[PDB]
Design a binder for this molecule. Structure first.
Ligand SMILES: [Mn+2]
Length: 664
DNA sequence: TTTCC
């Protein structure tokens, strides 16, 4: 059923993905690599003291604080929704092998019994309306760029200077490129303006994954993670095989002499895509304005910030269903891409720009090194972009594509199983838009709060409410999938955007509260995803610019947690047993050091002015800029701090670009 | 020597 074309790094199609410079060449050839991360300055993730500390803390907490989740995934009691064995990973060493990314998800989707298009005319309107509401009256802003990010194919540059030129250039030739694409000359477009080529696969760590302790054997069990070998990936499942990767960390002893204590495993690795910046720029240019619109006008269902922010909305519900999507990104439907593009043209978006946007969602992928002696292969032909990988992370609007898909999907689940009486309100585009715009503002008897694949569905007192309960029940029994679009189910440990919904005996949205997930504190602090990169002079360019800072926001972030106090003590204690030092003290030092280093990067901070003027968010973001790509937005961060992490292109240059893209 | 609000 069309095996994807594949080329070796030596084939000219691959070669042309990397420019004639060291950086690029090196990325094309980068071989499999692993090794312990510098968890904190001077501390190796596999250091024996640490591993012991981890073994004792994890064992203890699990024992003394077992999960408090009811038959309905609602979490009550201690706020603990699972054991603490997730920290038992030798951070820095991946499971082998990683997965080859699947070239086409058509068969995957079909075998999962999910639709290949809007299933009913209503749905077709709803999705299309989502596009109309989202892409309509956008306000130009400057194109922000993450500092130290790679431009990937073809240059692989990190120099902000270069990135800016690259972007400004793209905005200037995007139009000419898109047209070249409309004429079917992708090679021309790639060669002339670097808009095309392929995504660069970078494997990322999932520092914590499930691990359980079989009471019978007294042995631990790492959650298996299925992976696709090359054959499977190119044949969309037809041939090849799918199997569990090996998380066994015994090899570490034999290979690096690293002592592996019982019950520790290699990390789970997820694929990630590095988009060719020349192409992603013009897209990001439009993407941010969209974020601004939906986060403002549709702030009810789309703009989420504090534990209290969310709590306010949910408290007024009579029923709150916390859903869960399976493998969101690889399931995302190419038809939604096409539908969106088509509707965009109807709204009146420059063809060339829509063509760029489309192409960006069907681009080939260059697999680096999923395992030793593997990779260096390009999937799909750049001359004629026709892949169906689902959502590709490095794409300029991945979050938007996911939200658009899922938000309408949940609204449909509600309509289908609990609110048929609302169907009559959706007769055509206008009536559809009207309905959706009211729905998104939280003004209907059915509601949702969401971001990509996380969401909470609500029902107020009313006609749909009885249906709501029925649906939730369909979900508990979980024998039938409530949607025709994605595989939905309820989240075992109902939580939204990092905060857990803590129900009391009543088990109701009004008497429930939002506490931080205590586990996430543990994961952030003892299982980071990247080391401290002390070798990188520019902390603003590091994955973890100022680690110590997160101590400051800790109380604010997780304090509301029921077992907070206990865990901090459990830690301090186990840390004493393992290092003969006070963990609190350790972090207070890191806090002081980092707070001082920070002022060097904040123009407005006196050369020793405290953390006075900074929000908890500011801190969590500075400690982990990644939270900016999944939890918060430029708007939730103090301006002077956002500047530290991002740098932008002139509003003039972008505003002019946008003006030629948008319809009105 | 490696992505995206
Ligand atoms: Mn959730």
């Amino acid at each position: 059923p069309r095996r994807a074309p594949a080329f070796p790094l030596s084939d000219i199609k691959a070669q042309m993905l990397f420019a004639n410079n060291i950086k690029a060449q090196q990325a094309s050839k980068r071989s499999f690599k692993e090794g312990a991360i510098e968890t904190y300055e001077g501390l190796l993730s596999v250091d024996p003291r640490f591993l012991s500390f981890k073994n004792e803390l994890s064992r203890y907490l699990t024992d003394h604080f077992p999960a408090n989740v009811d038959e309905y995934g609602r979490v009550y009691g201690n706020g603990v929704r699972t054991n603490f064995f997730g920290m038992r990973h030798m951070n820095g060493f991946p499971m082998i092998p990683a997965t080859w990314p699947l070239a086409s998800n058509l068969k995957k989707r079909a075998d999962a019994d999910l639709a290949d298009g809007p299933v009913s005319e209503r749905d077709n309107l709803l999705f299309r309306a989502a596009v109309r509401l989202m892409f309509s009256d956008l306000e130009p802003v400057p194109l922000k760029i993450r500092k130290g990010s790679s431009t990937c194919i073809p240059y692989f540059s990190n120099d902000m200077g270069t990135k800016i030129e690259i972007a400004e250039r793209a905005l200037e030739k995007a139009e000419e490129a898109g047209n070249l694409m409309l004429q079917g000359k992708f090679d021309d477009a790639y060669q002339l303006h670097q808009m095309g080529g392929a995504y660069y696969v970078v494997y990322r760590a999932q520092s914590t994954d499930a691990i359980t302790l079989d009471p019978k054997t007294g042995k631990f069990v790492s959650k298996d993670r299925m992976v696709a070998d090359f054959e499977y990936a190119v044949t969309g499942g037809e041939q090849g095989s799918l199997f569990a990767a090996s998380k066994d960390a015994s090899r570490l002893k034999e290979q690096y002499g690293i002592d592996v204590p019982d019950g520790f495993f290699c990390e789970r690795r997820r694929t990630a895509m590095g988009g060719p910046f020349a192409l992603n720029a013009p897209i990001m240019a439009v993407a941010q304005p969209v974020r601004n619109k939906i986060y403002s006008k549709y702030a009810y269902t789309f703009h989420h910030t504090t534990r209290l922010n969310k709590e306010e909305k949910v408290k007024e519900w009579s029923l709150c269903v916390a859903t869960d999507v399976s493998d969101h990104d690889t399931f995302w439907p190419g038809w939604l891409r096409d539908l969106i593009c088509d509707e965009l043209l109807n709204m009146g978006y420059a063809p060339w720009w829509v063509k760029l946007f489309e192409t960006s969602l069907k681009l080939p992928v260059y697999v680096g090194a999923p395992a030793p002696e593997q990779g260096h292969t390009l999937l799909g032909d750049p001359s004629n972009p026709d892949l169906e990988v689902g959502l590709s992370s490095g794409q300029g609007a991945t979050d938007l594509m996911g939200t658009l898909l899922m938000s309408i999907t949940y609204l449909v689940m509600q309509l289908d199983h609990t609110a048929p009486h609302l169907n009559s309100r959706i007769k055509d585009m206008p009536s559809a838009c009207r309905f959706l715009d009211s729905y998104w503002q939280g003004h209907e008897e059915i509601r949702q709060i969401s971001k990509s694949d996380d969401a909470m569905l609500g029902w107020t007192k009313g006609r749909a409410l009885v249906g709501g309960h029925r649906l939730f029940e369909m979900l508990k029994e979980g024998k039938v999938n409530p949607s025709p679009y994605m595989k939905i189910s309820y989240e075992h440990g109902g939580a939204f955007l990092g905060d857990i919904l803590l129900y009391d005996s009543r088990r109701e949205p009004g008497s429930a509260i939002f506490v931080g997930n205590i586990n996430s504190m543990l994961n952030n602090q003892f299982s980071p995803e990247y080391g401290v990169q002390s070798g990188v002079r520019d902390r603003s360019k590091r994955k973890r610019p100022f680690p110590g800072l997160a101590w400051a926001s800790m109380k604010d972030t997780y304090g509301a947690c029921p077992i907070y106090s206990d865990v901090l003590e459990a830690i301090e204690r186990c840390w004493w047993n393992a290092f003969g030092e006070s963990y609190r003290a350790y972090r207070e030092d890191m806090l002081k050091r980092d707070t001082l280093e920070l002022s060097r990067y904040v123009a407005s901070m006196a050369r020793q002015a405290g953390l006075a003027e900074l929000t908890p968010i500011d801190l969590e973001v500075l400690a982990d800029p990644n939270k900016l790509q999944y939890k918060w937005t430029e708007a939730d961060v103090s301006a002077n701090i956002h500047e530290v992490l991002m740098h932008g292109v002139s509003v003039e240059k972008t505003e002019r670009f946008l003006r030629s893209v948008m319809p009105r």
